Design an enzyme around this catalytic site. Structure first.
Site, PDB file in Angstrom:
ATOM      1  N   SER A   1       0.826  -1.204   0.000  1.00  0.00           N
ATOM      2  CA  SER A   1       0.000   0.000   0.000  1.00  0.00           C
ATOM      3  C   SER A   1       0.861   1.255   0.000  1.00  0.00           C
ATOM      4  O   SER A   1       2.035   1.214   0.364  1.00  0.00           O
ATOM      5  CB  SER A   1      -0.930   0.016   1.213  1.00  0.00           C
TER       6      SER A   1
ATOM      7  N   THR B   1       4.601   0.481   6.862  1.00  0.00           N
ATOM      8  CA  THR B   1       5.311  -0.693   6.374  1.00  0.00           C
ATOM      9  C   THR B   1       5.176  -0.795   4.859  1.00  0.00           C
ATOM     10  O   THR B   1       6.160  -1.006   4.151  1.00  0.00           O
ATOM     11  CB  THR B   1       4.778  -1.986   7.019  1.00  0.00           C
TER      12      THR B   1
ATOM     13  N   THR C   1      -6.627   4.722   6.890  1.00  0.00           N
ATOM     14  CA  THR C   1      -6.140   4.273   8.190  1.00  0.00           C
ATOM     15  C   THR C   1      -5.211   5.311   8.805  1.00  0.00           C
ATOM     16  O   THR C   1      -4.617   5.071   9.853  1.00  0.00           O
ATOM     17  CB  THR C   1      -5.383   2.936   8.090  1.00  0.00           C
TER      18      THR C   1
ATOM     19  N   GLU D   1      -1.273   9.548   5.037  1.00  0.00           N
ATOM     20  CA  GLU D   1      -1.075   8.648   3.907  1.00  0.00           C
ATOM     21  C   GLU D   1      -0.545   9.379   2.667  1.00  0.00           C
ATOM     22  O   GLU D   1       0.234   8.807   1.908  1.00  0.00           O
ATOM     23  CB  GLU D   1      -2.376   7.914   3.576  1.00  0.00           C
TER      24      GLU D   1
ATOM     25  N   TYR E   1     -12.709  -5.120   3.705  1.00  0.00           N
ATOM     26  CA  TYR E   1     -11.457  -5.400   3.014  1.00  0.00           C
ATOM     27  C   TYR E   1     -11.574  -6.718   2.260  1.00  0.00           C
ATOM     28  O   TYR E   1     -10.985  -6.890   1.196  1.00  0.00           O
ATOM     29  CB  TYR E   1     -10.285  -5.447   4.000  1.00  0.00           C
TER      30      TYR E   1
ATOM     31  N   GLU F   1       8.111  -8.621 -20.838  1.00  0.00           N
ATOM     32  CA  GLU F   1       7.138  -8.322 -21.879  1.00  0.00           C
ATOM     33  C   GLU F   1       6.083  -7.327 -21.399  1.00  0.00           C
ATOM     34  O   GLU F   1       5.423  -6.677 -22.208  1.00  0.00           O
ATOM     35  CB  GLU F   1       6.474  -9.612 -22.360  1.00  0.00           C
TER      36      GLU F   1
HETATM   37  N1  LIG Z   1      -7.834  -2.753  -0.706  1.00  0.00           N
HETATM   38  C1  LIG Z   1      -7.319  -2.930   0.506  1.00  0.00           C
HETATM   39  N2  LIG Z   1      -6.660  -1.896   1.137  1.00  0.00           N
HETATM   40  C2  LIG Z   1      -6.137  -2.079   2.372  1.00  0.00           C
HETATM   41  C3  LIG Z   1      -6.254  -3.301   3.015  1.00  0.00           C
HETATM   42  N3  LIG Z   1      -5.649  -3.203   4.217  1.00  0.00           N
HETATM   43  C4  LIG Z   1      -5.151  -1.953   4.349  1.00  0.00           C
HETATM   44  N4  LIG Z   1      -5.455  -1.243   3.217  1.00  0.00           N
HETATM   45  C5  LIG Z   1      -5.093   0.155   2.927  1.00  0.00           C
HETATM   46  O1  LIG Z   1      -3.759   0.397   3.330  1.00  0.00           O
HETATM   47  C6  LIG Z   1      -3.606   1.735   3.757  1.00  0.00           C
HETATM   48  C7  LIG Z   1      -2.734   1.788   5.006  1.00  0.00           C
HETATM   49  O2  LIG Z   1      -1.661   0.880   4.889  1.00  0.00           O
HETATM   50  P1  LIG Z   1      -1.637  -0.506   5.709  1.00  0.00           P
HETATM   51  O3  LIG Z   1      -1.353  -1.664   4.784  1.00  0.00           O
HETATM   52  O4  LIG Z   1      -2.947  -0.693   6.431  1.00  0.00           O
HETATM   53  O5  LIG Z   1      -0.484  -0.315   6.818  1.00  0.00           O
HETATM   54  P2  LIG Z   1       0.868  -1.188   6.808  1.00  0.00           P
HETATM   55  O6  LIG Z   1       1.330  -1.469   5.400  1.00  0.00           O
HETATM   56  O7  LIG Z   1       0.650  -2.475   7.568  1.00  0.00           O
HETATM   57  O8  LIG Z   1       1.948  -0.255   7.555  1.00  0.00           O
HETATM   58  P3  LIG Z   1       1.865   0.052   9.135  1.00  0.00           P
HETATM   59  O9  LIG Z   1       1.559   1.513   9.362  1.00  0.00           O
HETATM   60  O10 LIG Z   1       3.210  -0.274   9.734  1.00  0.00           O
HETATM   61  O11 LIG Z   1       0.803  -0.801   9.782  1.00  0.00           O
HETATM   62  C8  LIG Z   1      -4.999   2.284   4.012  1.00  0.00           C
HETATM   63  O12 LIG Z   1      -5.264   3.372   3.157  1.00  0.00           O
HETATM   64  C9  LIG Z   1      -5.944   1.141   3.714  1.00  0.00           C
HETATM   65  O13 LIG Z   1      -7.066   1.589   2.990  1.00  0.00           O
HETATM   66  C10 LIG Z   1      -6.915  -4.346   2.389  1.00  0.00           C
HETATM   67  O14 LIG Z   1      -7.026  -5.436   2.949  1.00  0.00           O
HETATM   68  N5  LIG Z   1      -7.445  -4.153   1.131  1.00  0.00           N
HETATM   69  C1  LIG Z   2      -8.054   4.437  20.650  1.00  0.00           C
HETATM   70  O1  LIG Z   2      -8.231   5.776  20.184  1.00  0.00           O
HETATM   71  C2  LIG Z   2      -8.360   5.965  18.788  1.00  0.00           C
HETATM   72  C3  LIG Z   2      -7.243   6.319  17.952  1.00  0.00           C
HETATM   73  C4  LIG Z   2      -7.309   6.493  16.548  1.00  0.00           C
HETATM   74  C5  LIG Z   2      -6.086   6.913  15.663  1.00  0.00           C
HETATM   75  C6  LIG Z   2      -6.422   8.029  14.446  1.00  0.00           C
HETATM   76  C7  LIG Z   2      -6.917   9.279  14.854  1.00  0.00           C
HETATM   77  C8  LIG Z   2      -7.290  10.414  13.822  1.00  0.00           C
HETATM   78  C9  LIG Z   2      -7.134  10.158  12.454  1.00  0.00           C
HETATM   79  C10 LIG Z   2      -6.597   8.775  11.962  1.00  0.00           C
HETATM   80  C11 LIG Z   2      -6.261   7.744  12.874  1.00  0.00           C
HETATM   81  C12 LIG Z   2      -5.686   6.270  12.388  1.00  0.00           C
HETATM   82  O2  LIG Z   2      -4.349   6.312  11.946  1.00  0.00           O
HETATM   83  C13 LIG Z   2      -5.898   5.263  13.541  1.00  0.00           C
HETATM   84  C14 LIG Z   2      -5.279   3.912  13.366  1.00  0.00           C
HETATM   85  O3  LIG Z   2      -5.175   3.450  14.715  1.00  0.00           O
HETATM   86  C15 LIG Z   2      -5.122   4.616  15.879  1.00  0.00           C
HETATM   87  O4  LIG Z   2      -4.936   4.716  17.050  1.00  0.00           O
HETATM   88  C16 LIG Z   2      -5.346   5.755  14.991  1.00  0.00           C
HETATM   89  O5  LIG Z   2      -7.519  11.310  11.712  1.00  0.00           O
HETATM   90  C17 LIG Z   2      -7.743  12.366  12.671  1.00  0.00           C
HETATM   91  O6  LIG Z   2      -7.783  11.740  13.990  1.00  0.00           O
HETATM   92  C18 LIG Z   2      -8.618   6.319  16.016  1.00  0.00           C
HETATM   93  C19 LIG Z   2      -9.809   5.962  16.752  1.00  0.00           C
HETATM   94  O7  LIG Z   2     -11.087   5.784  16.147  1.00  0.00           O
HETATM   95  C20 LIG Z   2     -11.402   6.577  14.996  1.00  0.00           C
HETATM   96  C21 LIG Z   2      -9.673   5.774  18.192  1.00  0.00           C
HETATM   97  O8  LIG Z   2     -10.788   5.427  18.958  1.00  0.00           O
END
Ligand SMILES: Nc1nc2c(ncn2[C@@H]2O[C@H](COP(=O)(O)OP(=O)(O)OP(=O)(O)O)[C@@H](O)[C@H]2O)c(=O)[nH]1
Ligand SMILES: COc1cc([C@@H]2c3cc4c(cc3[C@@H](O)[C@H]3COC(=O)[C@H]23)OCO4)cc(OC)c1O
Ligand SMILES: Nc1ncnc2c1ncn2[C@@H]1O[C@H](COP(=O)(O)OP(=O)(O)CP(=O)(O)O)[C@@H](O)[C@H]1O
Ligand SMILES: Nc1nc2c(ncn2[C@@H]2O[C@H](COP(=O)(O)OP(=O)(O)O)[C@@H](O)[C@H]2O)c(=O)[nH]1
Ligand SMILES: [Ca+2]
Ligand SMILES: [Mg+2]
Ligand SMILES: [Mg+2]
Lengths: 437, 54, 334, 427
Positions: A140, A145, A179, A183, A224, A254
């Site tokens: 992604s 990662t 997520t 991003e 997902y 290719e």
């Molecule tokens: N289509 C699709 N997108 C995914 C899936 N899982 C995560 N994503 C996308 O991946 C993006 C974030 O990257 P991740 O793969 O979740 O995070 P990571 O590669 O594990 O990197 P970390 O931050 O270390 O966890 C988000 O925008 C998600 O929408 C999936 O199962 N299917």
């Molecule tokens: C336990 O407390 C929480 C924390 C998070 C944060 C978070 C906060 C954000 C955002 C993205 C993300 C995202 O990167 C999450 C992945 O996992 C996280 O912890 C992160 O955009 C503006 O504010 C989210 C929760 O629900 C929505 C929550 O309840």
């Protein structure tokens, strides 16, 4: 026969890898325990499917694939999943703590303490290859990662495997299933560092997949699982030529030859059709002309954009099911007179076509219905640059205030790399412009 | 119009149709980047522990 | 409560539109760079169409058609007509034109220039207006940009009293469903000084722009004759109507031009939608034969007609997509 | 990813004890430490907060701290008093007399090493410690003074671990002493430097909610903590349970904190309810959304319209249409886009958990990093200056070795923090 190794990095890469390799098994009749009855060459052979599967004396067919994630959570479900017997432990690598949606943390910090291990586990597969073509890397843009560690890996593979090709299946970020807010940073950063190290990258905007699942599969909120099982079908279409008997896209080189004239511009647009719901009671099977015509509908593209206001450098049509060349040419002729299809002056206006009589396999109990014929169009159009523009804009909005920058700098990265990456993207948008208008 | 390079087999067939004619860093450098960033982390952590020492 | 943005401050038309929207109390204006909008009154250059239709939970609309410049640029309009089977070279309502680049189809232009000279018929053209090809080619290369050479209509219809030249401006609105709406009210941008056939140097009675004219205001207010007066004149002076003698041809040219490029700009199955106001400039010869001059992508309105037209845009182009809590347009069916 | 909980002082232990009481029930854990639930969703990520012992006994990874045994004795005799590991009870005898200097420099310094020994013992058991969360007040002496001392020393020994805090702000509406503005200003100075995440739990807000909304004529600390434990349970939801997204204390900091110093959050909750009084009517999703964003539902006495949201995290609990949640959340941003900064695209993220809190069919917890929070600190700053301009009550501190300069520095840094929040309100 030449082998292909598939590398799945991050959550998105792993979970999609699960969707693909699941589908691969059904298409090749391989069972969850790795047994393939139809394979009469026990313990080896150089068939087309051996490109993706190696064989053991015990008659098990194992994927030439490695899974890597800085967090054990996702891969742990592979270790205990239905296809647990398929892979062997050395193929599934896991860290202790993830990159926390931070490119710099996945690339520099945590990337440094596991890169040598991964390459070693990859070298163990390459040693089992007689003629390695290259690698298929699933990841992604948004993940720490997926963005961070991938770019580092891609850099090392170009050193350890200089003559080998490297294709990408990348997930473009979408707020509907985001997520992280950073991003856009991770996307620009990984693209810049990886660009020179990637030969052909297929981008898949989750936004596009999300709306397709809602519009055509009638899924109100795609999981997902719903997104991945659809993407796997697209990946299957693209990789089928490497796993089956054919004469089009038989090897990784290719792909670059037929889809990528200019090296930097190596992001082909994918368009798939038809997408039909399994629980759709009454469905009228679509024809070659109908499915082919849908390849030029933006609502069926892996990335939402407008090819009309751009220019094609290449275009491949990959059919699966009841299709013959006659009906294809008839469809192309009709479509050409109805739609705007401008090729660059220094390219021939034509289509490389590939057909596989075996229709697209569907996961039992999935959301997709069986169809008599399907198609995936791989067109390298300058219109895909709209995605770069979107992304680079979101990047500029945040970086003007240096928001969230301190998290990256705190991991040993320099604030200059932000501007260095963004400048490379600015150059990329220009290259698309010169070719397009 | 012009269909060419027709290749048929049991699994399927492929061809090409034309409508109209036309008109890396080294391992050294990498290890240098990763170690350089690691030093910056060490410097930052040192300034912290120095500040905390005060 | 819908939301919109303004990115073209110089737009006299949409400055009125934004005013009308706020006056409904159901539309809220946002800042320029606020992406969370339902409507966009975009700029004229480098409008970011690429960033439209990517906001979840927002149906987005813009007041411009991407690719519509192919019709609103003189060099592009000629190329469009010559290369489009729908219009073709044989089309009778567009003057014989050629695309010329400074030091292309210059050789082709001279081939026709000879038939006019070796036929002893009217041989006057326009970029300046001259009867000598050498005087024109020397002018283009001296300017710098790309210009279009076009046949000058030497026998235009002349209003009386005055013996005057004129051109017709029709305002057309194309909504998100690509319905072509012709504004029932047009305007004749007339010349006040009598048309001189011999002297082309005097460009005050040849060119009928509202700015050049500004004998200004002698016959009608502001060198602008509306359809009611022009219709009355045709009845009295030529025993016919505006509908019959002219408007059918206008409705035909408009319908033809937009049907041609529909598949290239239509936002039917797109992620964002488009509408746009156009300004077609027509020219009528002494035989009541209408000719298309050009198309304006960002047209301005006449002072009298701003209120009615701008209100019209809101009704069929905006409120049709974003409904709130007899018609002044003529629907050109197709 | 284990979290080490710490609770310091009277306030810290009383909201901390209530916190474990609430979530223990949500995870099906009884006072005995035994599991008696019906869903596996409860045990999937229970390791984040609980250590497991033989016989499948679940023990909170919590450390109870105080300079007097008074409040901690009440905890040990409370409902879930027996669940806590008895060795994690670290206490003195002298108290801090609501003196920041005593908790930070003299009295607390004498006990702090004992606490850090327990912190270290728990940490070494963690498979992969992600960080610490602290519960305390800033108006007192122990939780305010010694709490910030612990944080500083925890950062020294675990500089790459996240520090989270639930900090109760003082208010004249609910006051113990007049030196609360002093203790707070001194503590905020520490929190700006040595925490990544601080939930600002303002007592002024908690009082106004009980009085104005819940119609409680004379609210008690018990009434105030019903709101706190509800908020604490809500914000920790996505840490404690599995779901679409799974949160941790680092990913929390990365996405919520655009600039390191600006990490003071506004908690919010809906529906607002009082103790005992059960509600029979479940709120519709449009109602949960409208209320959780209303100022009347904010746990920090700040008007969100007087500022702009940098980042927002919302968690909906209960069985509901996650589609409807998406539409309503998007509706809010689209209706009031002026109150969300445009230079951070998509700064509102939502999550949904199937398990609702006790006594409610569905709820919604709010976490906002608003620039309007400056109103909170400006309030403390005014109350601080009013006394400090006359050096009033300063002898309590100078008697413990502190100098006036240290007050002037703390005052200056908080006024800076205010101006920084003001900088991005007009960006
Ligand atoms: N289509 C699709 N997108 C995914 C899936 N899982 C995560 N994503 C996308 O991946 C993006 C974030 O990257 P991740 O793969 O979740 O995070 P990571 O590669 O594990 O990197 P970390 O931050 O270390 O966890 C988000 O925008 C998600 O929408 C999936 O199962 N299917
Ligand atoms: C336990 O407390 C929480 C924390 C998070 C944060 C978070 C906060 C954000 C955002 C993205 C993300 C995202 O990167 C999450 C992945 O996992 C996280 O912890 C992160 O955009 C503006 O504010 C989210 C929760 O629900 C929505 C929550 O309840
Ligand atoms: N080929 C031709 N034959 C006769 N008259 C012509 C002509 N080409 C242009 N004109 C005369 O051209 C005058 C000015 O050019 P045109 O109308 O295209 O304006 P621009 O200023 O060129 C377009 P607009 O002012 O509407 O934005 C026309 O209004 C009309 O007076
Ligand atoms: N919300 C809440 N606040 C409290 C409680 N007890 C004390 N406080 C607040 O904390 C401050 C007093 O600090 P205190 O906790 O008694 O100091 P300490 O015990 O020495 O750390 C005052 O401003 C009180 O309003 C409580 O139970 N709940
Ligand atoms: Ca075999
Ligand atoms: Mg991950
Ligand atoms: Mg007290």
């Amino acid at each position: 026969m030449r082998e292909c190794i598939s590398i799945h990095v991050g959550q998105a890469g792993v979970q999609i890898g699960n969707a693909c390799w699941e589908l691969y098994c059904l298409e090749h009749g391989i069972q969850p325990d790795g047994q393939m009855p139809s394979d009469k060459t026990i313990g080896g052979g150089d068939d087309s499917f051996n490109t993706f599967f190696s064989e053991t004396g015990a008659g098990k067919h194992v994927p030439r694939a490695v899974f890597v994630d800085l967090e054990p959570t996702v891969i742990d479900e592979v270790r205990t999943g239905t296809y647990r017997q398929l892979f062997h432990p050395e193929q599934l690598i896991t860290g202790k703590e993830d990159a926390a949606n931070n490119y710099a943390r996945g690339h520099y910090t945590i990337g440094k303490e596991i890169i040598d291990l991964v390459l070693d586990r990859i070298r163990k597969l390459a040693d089992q290859c007689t003629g390695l073509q290259g690698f298929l890397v699933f990841h992604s843009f948004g993940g720490g990662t997926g963005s961070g560690f991938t770019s580092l890996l891609m850099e090392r593979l170009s050193v350890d495997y200089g003559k080998k090709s490297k294709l990408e299946f990348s997930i473009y970020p979408a707020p509907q299933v985001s997520t992280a807010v950073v991003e856009p940073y991770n996307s620009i950063l990984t693209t810049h560092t990886t660009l020179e190290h990637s030969d052909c990258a297929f981008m898949v905007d989750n936004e596009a997949i999300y709306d397709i699942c809602r519009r055509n599969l009638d899924i109100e909120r795609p999981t997902y699982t719903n997104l991945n099982r659809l993407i796997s079908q697209i990946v299957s279409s693209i990789t089928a030529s490497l796993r089956f008997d054919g004469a089009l896209n038989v090897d990784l080189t290719e792909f670059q030859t037929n889809l990528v004239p200019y090296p930097r511009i190596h992001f082909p647009l994918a368009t798939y059709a038809p997408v039909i719901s399994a629980e759709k009671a009454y469905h009228e099977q679509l024809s070659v002309a109908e499915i082919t015509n849908a390849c030029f509908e933006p609502a069926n593209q892996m990335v939402k954009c407008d090819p009309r206001h751009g220019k094609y450098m290449a275009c491949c049509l990959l059919y699966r099911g009841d299709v013959v060349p006659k009906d294809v040419n008839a469809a192309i002729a009709t479509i050409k007179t109805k739609r705007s299809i401008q090729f660059v002056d220094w390219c021939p206006t034509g289509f490389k076509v590939g057909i596989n009589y075996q229709p697209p396999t569907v996961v039992p109990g999935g959301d997709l219905a069986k169809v008599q014929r399907a198609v995936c169009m791989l067109s390298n159009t300058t219109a895909i640059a709209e995605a770069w523009a979107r992304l680079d804009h979101k990047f500029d909005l945040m970086y003007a205030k240096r928001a969230f920058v301190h998290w990256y700098v705190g991991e040993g990265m320099e604030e200059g790399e932000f501007s260095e990456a963004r400048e490379d993207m600015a150059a990329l948008e220009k290259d698309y412009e010169e070719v397009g208008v | 119009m012009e269909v060419i390079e027709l290749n048929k087999c049991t699994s399927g067939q492929s061809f090409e149709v034309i409508l109209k004619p036309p008109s890396d860093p080294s391992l050294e450098e990498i290890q240098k980047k990763l170690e350089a960033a690691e030093e910056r982390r060490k410097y930052q952590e040192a300034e912290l522990l120095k500040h905390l020492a005060e | 409560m819908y939301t919109f943005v303004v990115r073209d401050e110089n737009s006299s038309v949409y400055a009125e539109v934004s005013r009308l929207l706020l006056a409904t109390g159901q539309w809220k204006r946002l800042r320029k760079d606020n992406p969370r909008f339902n409507l966009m009154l975009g700029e004229r250059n480098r409008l970011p169409f690429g960033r439209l239709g990517h906001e979840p939970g927002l149906v987005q609309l813009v007041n411009y058609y991407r690719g519509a410049d192919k019709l609103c640029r003189k060099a592009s309009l000629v190329k469009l007509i010559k290369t489009s089977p729908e219009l073709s070279e044989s089309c009778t309502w567009f003057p014989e034109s050629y695309v010329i680049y400074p030091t292309d189809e210059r050789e082709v232009f001279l081939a026709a220039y000879n038939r006019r000279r070796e036929g002893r018929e009217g041989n006057v053209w326009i970029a300046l207006i001259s009867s000598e090809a050498s005087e024109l080619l020397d002018f283009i290369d001296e300017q710098g940009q790309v210009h279009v050479i076009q046949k000058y209509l030497e026998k235009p219809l002349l209003l009386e009293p005055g013996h005057r030249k004129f051109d017709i401006r029709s305002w057309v609105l194309v909504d998100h469903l690509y319905n072509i709406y012709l504004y029932r009210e047009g305007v004749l941008r007339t010349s006040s000084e009598p048309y001189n056939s011999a002297n082309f140097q005097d460009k005050t009675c040849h060119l009928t722009n509202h700015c050049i004219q500004k004998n200004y205001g002698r016959y009608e207010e502001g060198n602008e004759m509306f359809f009611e007066e022009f219709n009355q004149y045709l009845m009295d002076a030529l025993n016919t109507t505006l509908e019959n003698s002219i408007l059918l041809q206008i409705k035909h040219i408009i319908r033809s031009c937009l049907m041609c490029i529909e598949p290239a700009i239509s936002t039917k199955h797109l992620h964002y939608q488009s509408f746009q106001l156009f300004g077609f400039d027509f020219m009528v010869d002494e035989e009541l034969k209408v000719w298309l001059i050009e198309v304006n992508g960002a047209p301005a309105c006449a002072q009298k007609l701003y209120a009615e037209l701008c209100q019209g845009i809101v009704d069929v182009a905006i409120s049709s997509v974003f409904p709130l809590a007899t018609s002044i347009f003529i629907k050109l069916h197709h | 990813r284990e979290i080490v909980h710490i609770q310091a002082g009277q306030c810290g232990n009383q909201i901390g004890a209530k916190f474990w009481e609430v979530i223990s029930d949500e995870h099906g854990i009884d006072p005995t430490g035994s599991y008696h639930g019906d869903s596996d969703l409860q045990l999937e990520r229970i390791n984040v907060y609980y250590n497991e012992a033989t016989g499948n006994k679940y023990v909170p990874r919590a450390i109870l701290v105080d300079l007097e045994p008074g409040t901690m004795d009440s905890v040990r005799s409370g409902p879930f008093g027996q669940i806590f590991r008895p060795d994690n009870f670290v206490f003195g005898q002298s108290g801090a007399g609501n003196n920041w200097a005593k908790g930070h420099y003299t009295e607390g310094a004498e006990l702090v090493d004992s606490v850090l020994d327990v912190v270290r013992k728990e940490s070494e058991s963690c498979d992969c410690l992600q960080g610490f969360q602290l519960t305390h007040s800033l108006g007192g002496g122990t939780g305010s003074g010694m709490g910030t001392l612990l944080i500083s020393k925890i950062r020294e020994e675990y500089p790459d671990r996240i520090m989270n805090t639930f900090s109760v702000m003082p208010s004249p509406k609910v006051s113990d002493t007049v030196v609360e503005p002093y203790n707070a200003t001194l503590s905020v100075h520490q929190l700006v430097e040595n925490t990544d995440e601080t939930y600002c739990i303002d007592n002024e807000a908690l009082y106004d909610i009980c009085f104005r909304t819940l119609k409680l004529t004379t609210p008690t600390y018990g009434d105030l903590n019903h709101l706190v434990s509800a908020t604490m349970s809500g914000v920790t939801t996505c840490l404690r349970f599995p779901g679409q997204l799974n949160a941790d204390l680092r990913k929390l900091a990365v996405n919520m904190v655009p600039f390191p110093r600006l990490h003071f959050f506004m908690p919010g909750f809906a529906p607002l309810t009082s103790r005992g009084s059960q509600q029979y009517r479940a709120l519709t999703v449009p109602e949960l959304t409208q209320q959780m964003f209303d100022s009347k539902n904010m746990m920090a006495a700040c008007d969100p319209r007087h500022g702009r949201y940098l980042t927002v995290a919302a968690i909906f609990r209960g069985r509901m249409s996650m589609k409807e949640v998406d539409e309503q959340m998007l509706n809010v941003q689209n209706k009031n886009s002026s109150y969300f900064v445009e230079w951070i695209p998509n700064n509102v993220k939502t999550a949904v958990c199937d398990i609702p809190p006790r006594g409610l069919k569905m709820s919604a917890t709010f976490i906002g990093n608003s620039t309007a929070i400056q109103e909170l600190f400006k309030r403390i700053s005014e109350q601080f200056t009013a006394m400090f301009r006359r050096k009033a009550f300063l002898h309590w501190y100078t008697g413990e070795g502190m100098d006036e300069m240290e007050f002037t520095e703390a005052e200056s840094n908080m006024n800076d923090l205010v101006s920084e929040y003001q900088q991005y309100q007009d960006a």
